[PDB]
Ligand binder design. Structure first.
Ligand code: NIN
Length: 124
């Protein structure tokens, strides 16, 4: 029902800001995107770039994915990202996150026609 593409946008895209606003950013975002309904994801990354710049990653630098496949692409530039990692005080359903601001290259796996991002592989 929710495509892999759509799930990518829900889990990782945040074009509404240039960077995380407060230390509570990950707590608010994890909750509002419903990323903590099933369990507390241990880590998550949000990307603060336009959808078009992120989709364009699929025509950028081709690299190997962690699983060894070859449909992974690294952004030519660094992108503004927010790192969310569970704190020592997190127990489902009361997940808790540390928000960290970063600027790094993103690596995503792409698939389909249109060829779009479906999985966030790593940040470099
Ligand atoms: C989406 C986001 C997180 C998880 N999870 O298992 O942590 C699963 C899904 N999903 O669409 O299955």
């Amino acid at each position: 029902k929710e495509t892999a593409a759509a799930k990518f946008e829900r889990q990782h895209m945040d074009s509404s800001t240039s960077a995380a606003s407060s230390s509570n950013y990950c707590n608010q975002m994890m909750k509002s995107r419903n990323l903590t309904k099933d369990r507390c994801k241990p880590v998550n990354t949000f990307v603060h770039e336009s959808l078009a710049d992120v989709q364009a990653v699929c025509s950028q630098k081709n690299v190997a994915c962690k699983n060894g496949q070859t449909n992974c692409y690294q952004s030519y530039s660094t992108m503004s990202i927010t790192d969310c990692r569970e704190t020592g005080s997190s127990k489902y359903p009361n997940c808790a996150y540390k928000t960290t601001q970063a600027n790094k290259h993103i690596i995503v796996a792409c698939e389909g026609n249109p060829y779009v991002p479906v999985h966030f592989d790593a940040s470099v």
